[PDB]
Design a protein that fits this description.
The structure is cut from a larger assembly and holds chains A, B and C.
Chain A lengths: L1 E3 H18 L13 E2 L5 E2 L4 H6 L6 H16 L4 H21 L4 H21 L2 E2 L5 H8 L12 H15 L23 E5 L7 E3 L3 E2 L11 E2 L4 E4 L22 H20 L5 E4 L5 H8 L4 E3 L4 H11 L3 E2 L17 E2 L9 E2 L10 E6 L2 H22 L3 E4 L3 H14 L7 H10 L2 H10 L5 H12 L4 E3 L6 E3 L6 E3 H19 L3 E4 L2
Parallel strand pairs in A: 5-15, 9-10, 9-12, 10-11
Antiparallel strand pairs in A: 1-20, 2-3, 4-16, 6-15, 7-14, 8-13, 16-19, 17-18
Helix pairs in contact in A: 1-3, 1-4, 3-4, 3-16, 4-13, 4-16, 5-12, 5-13, 5-16, 6-7, 7-11, 8-9, 12-13
Chain B lengths: L12 H17 L10 E4 L5 E4 L2 H7 L5 H11 L9 H19 L5 H22 L10 H15 L3 H17 L53
Antiparallel strand pairs in B: 1-2
Helix pairs in contact in B: 1-3, 1-4, 2-3, 3-4, 6-7
Chain C lengths: L13 E4 L1 H19 L9 E4 L5 E4 L2 H6 L6 H16 L4 H20 L4 H20 L14 H8 L9 H13 L18 E5 L8 E3 L3 E2 L11 E2 L4 E6 L19 H24 L4 E4 L5 H9 L3 E4 L3 H10 L22 E4 L2 E5 L4 E5 L9 E5 L3 H23 L3 E3 L3 H14 L6 H11 L2 H9 L4 H18 L12 E4 L4 E4 H4 L2 E3 H19 L3 E4 L1
Parallel strand pairs in C: 4-14, 8-9, 9-10
Antiparallel strand pairs in C: 1-19, 2-3, 5-14, 6-13, 7-12, 8-11, 12-13, 15-18, 16-17
Amino acid sequence: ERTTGRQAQISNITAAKAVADVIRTCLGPKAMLKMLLDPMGGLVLTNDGHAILREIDVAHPAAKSMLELSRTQDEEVGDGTTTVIILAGEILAQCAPYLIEKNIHPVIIIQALKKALTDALEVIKQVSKPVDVENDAAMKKLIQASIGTKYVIHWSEKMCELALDAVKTVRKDLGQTVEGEPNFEIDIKRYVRVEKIPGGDVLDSRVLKGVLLNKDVVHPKMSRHIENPRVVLLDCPLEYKKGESQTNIEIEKEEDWNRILQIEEEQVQLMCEQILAVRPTLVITEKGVSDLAQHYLLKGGCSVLRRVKKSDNNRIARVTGATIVNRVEDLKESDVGTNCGLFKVEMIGDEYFSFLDNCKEPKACTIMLRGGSKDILNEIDRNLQDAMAVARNVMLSPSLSPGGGATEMAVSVKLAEKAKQLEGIQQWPYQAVADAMECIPRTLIQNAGGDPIRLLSQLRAKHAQGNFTTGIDGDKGKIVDMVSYGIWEPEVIKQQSVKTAIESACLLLRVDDIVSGV
Amino acid sequence: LLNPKAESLRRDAALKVNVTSAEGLQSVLETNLGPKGTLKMLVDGAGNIKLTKDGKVLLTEMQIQSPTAVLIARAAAAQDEITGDGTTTVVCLVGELLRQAHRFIQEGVHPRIITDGFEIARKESMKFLDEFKISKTNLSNDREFLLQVARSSLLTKVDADLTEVLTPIVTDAVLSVYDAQADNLDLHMVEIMQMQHLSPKDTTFIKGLVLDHGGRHPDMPTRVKNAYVL
Amino acid sequence: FNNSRSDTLFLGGEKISGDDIRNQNVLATMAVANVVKSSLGPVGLDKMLVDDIGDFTVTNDGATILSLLDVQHPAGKILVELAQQQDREIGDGTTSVVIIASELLKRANELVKNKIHPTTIITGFRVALREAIRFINEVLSTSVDTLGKETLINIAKTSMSSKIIGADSDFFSNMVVDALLAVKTQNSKGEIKYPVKAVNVLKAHGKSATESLLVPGYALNCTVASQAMPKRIAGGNVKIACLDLNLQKARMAMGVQINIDDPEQLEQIRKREAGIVLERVKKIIDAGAQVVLTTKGIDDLCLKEFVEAKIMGVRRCKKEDLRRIARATGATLVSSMSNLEGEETFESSYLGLCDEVVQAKFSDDECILIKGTSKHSSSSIILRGANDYSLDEMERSLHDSLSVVKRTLESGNVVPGGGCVEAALNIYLDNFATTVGSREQLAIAEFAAALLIIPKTLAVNAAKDSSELVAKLRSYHAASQMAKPEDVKRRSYRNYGLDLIRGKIVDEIHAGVLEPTISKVKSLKSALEACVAILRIDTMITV
């Protein structure tokens, strides 16, 4: 109904702590399993942090916010799902003695958290190392990190190559004092479309540079490829021509139907002759194409494709060079398919394709996936998307952060030292983030099986006096250097993780009242 | 840390209920292991009785309440599509593995420590198997051995009296459909047909097919030495 | 605490009356007010609003919070309609209206327990209200304090503090104010208002951000059609012809093919197709249009005549920009020619009457600047910055800053906020009460005290100790209200308010914390009406 005041504050933190707890031990290379009992009587042991949070019901609005928080993380960065949820929850937990017991107003805690974010972001940069995002071999070594223990690891050279060509094609790699530095804008959601085609094997995957159509034509049997293509893009239909008047055709007598058909035959032929004037190899019409029109154009040795939306022709024109015109008499002799090796109409898996590839890159690509079964195709697609996500995450910024809990530990140590100079009421909740960051190196130790205090204490000493690239060995549980044990992660993951985690904590800390009603 | 209309086991209780459930399933199916094992009764709720020792039949036809034992039952039953046997063995091994692991977990051994140890033992166990096995003579004419194979399988399932009847039937039925030139075979070439009004000890091997519809005239031949078939 | 089973007034229903319903009236109106109390002020806190399905939203908007508030008790539904009237008439302040109304009702219940009849409470509250509005009329002022100092700078500097442009706010805050002050207009019959859209904003990457340009008139994002045209024309008096219709060689029809066989036809077609637009150029030149701005473009032959006549012809203009020039310069666009089937550019009606038009170089960019004209109320700013990416954000911030300052300026009469009105009325009305000596003296005193709920709530929401922030206000305002009634002054320092960020008392006039007077007058009046509506209900019957 309604919960107010400190009860709302405790409820928000309590629920957030619960959600973080659900998957607390699901982080790390040695993640534990979680038994989820389904209302329908089944159960799974999945350790997938996303599925675990998705498939668990929550009541408290604060818990629901954390569920949406993970969805936001997934859209922005291809990783960090569980890091955001765990860190966000721990920050709220660390703020709890300050919000309730010390009676520090939310506005003070939120302000302190915003400053802690600013400082944490700078530290993450300080501990980063550069990479050469122009050196393909260096990028392949990083991309494989997302491919390991996947089916397609045996073909990871192809999965990396496709990710490299796809991301670099859409990457805005620019710097100047006029437009500014795009910061390597990359869109692997729309401009690298992936399509699964039956047949072949993993290694047979290819990248297309152009437009691929799935629409069938009037004559499925067409020359295997066109070496000298010319494409017509025409809106006007090829049918009985009407004027600008409101005149309708009304035929009552059975003998008079021939008058309309005979007129249409002449008009359709004349339109088609105008199209054929430029000797096309493929004619595409946005409106309908009469039966007679299909024969007039086809018989000349030309493919005809009817009822193609403008949204397709606008893309076809960019890779064919054809002009989109309204009237049949507006077509130009320059409507050709030059600057292209060939157009291919090869059928794959008894399905018609039209490949409109050329020698140009219209800021986009399409990836053809091949395989002997749908299961193979799905594994290739899912595994390639991981390769593209990490390729984006790296090529978004030429920097990596040390993993194994190293980065999170470095932020804790540096925030703790910064706190010494932050005199005032904000000093108290400010520390809350420095302590919260430990939830990552602590979880790694807990999964390793060591003592969370004694091993963390050794780690803290290494960061206090030594280098910031010291972390936890996933397999041994020992404190090791991330130089020998690379475990490097794209910096964007650590930057977005601390950003979204603190922002979420600041939101829930702001809510002193939950009110029902419609 | 809990939402209404929900429950979780956070402390080591999650492990105790998982081991306990597995121990239950073990304590039932262990009694079906070996030629000297006992015979389980299944009641379908409609009053029909079916008796079996077969692990897969026991796990797939019996309902289980414990969600943890369900996972074991399904994973073990999957063996039917891989080996065709050993379902009871898996359940027995899983039970005792969890019993022994639990004894060590009580001492503070993290489940991961036991898990990694199991994986090391598994890899060495497969090496042992490869060196422990004996290579069979590649001749298919070795009826004496194939009888031993059928006998070992039948003695698990029947009363040992039907073994004397079924052993040569199983052996010859499979060898009969075994392709020449030491090729593979498809045991679906042997039809499994049931009939009533005769004792189980009368189970017999038929060289050809048996048809349901017969002749319907008193003067139909009773037996023909050789015939052409229209 | 409940009331039922009256077992009297033998009816098919319940009866609750007297102190019973009055206690419910207090609890209900407080329960509703508590919903919005915590969200008062820019430093307040938000809340989650949870629907009956399973979704929710988080907001601090008082209108949304109250609209989505599930109110069961009829006593609280009075506050719902109270808010609705405020939202429809004023559109803001609903949070403070509900808060005050509840405080008035609560204190009214105390007066009833003290043997003050509700009728005398209702009257006394209305007596305090009428005097309270008279007081506000002696506090409010028009847009002032722009000579030797400027308060709008604090407005603009604050509004941009969240945007990239704020880094140089000590410069750009002047660009916001100086620009907007230049585009005050009159609409019809002397409205004296600032347009909802004014101060055309361009961008350039030429120089550092602090070199952004303030143009006294409109900046047109175009250059001369031909580099042979003057960049400075007719400094004495220049006319701008803003047209939509093309000066591109005319096409007789899009759907007709022209087949020319007779040499005479060559003359007829060549002269006609060119004559249409060339004759229009003759009318443009004859009308004095030394600047010619055409949307649908100008042919090369037409441009040649414009170059020779030293006319700054421009082709491919944006129609929206021409509407701004036309309106600003007193002109209307030439979308067509008619006037009894003739042809003209309508000198002095469709031509702008301007002082001078130039083309300016912005260090690797160019545009056309119009300096002055008879009566326009126009201006433009050209922002500079690190790069186009920063220029986009800077432009977005300027648009925001202009809206914030405009809203303040739109209200011809403003009164300082931050508790100034409530604290000042508290002291003034407390003195008013002393002139009664009957019953209304108590109603006025409680009415006055009720207004302190606002500066009290603001202080609490700021995380500051209200016992000092509010008490200091009473001290500062008491000084002004002890001198005021004697009409003795040489310098009078009043309108002290809460600085809810730093936690101190400031002069709100110079700080820039202003609220429209129409908001304060109608908010205070509305709050009383709800209090009366609830206080008048001493019986509820449920059938």
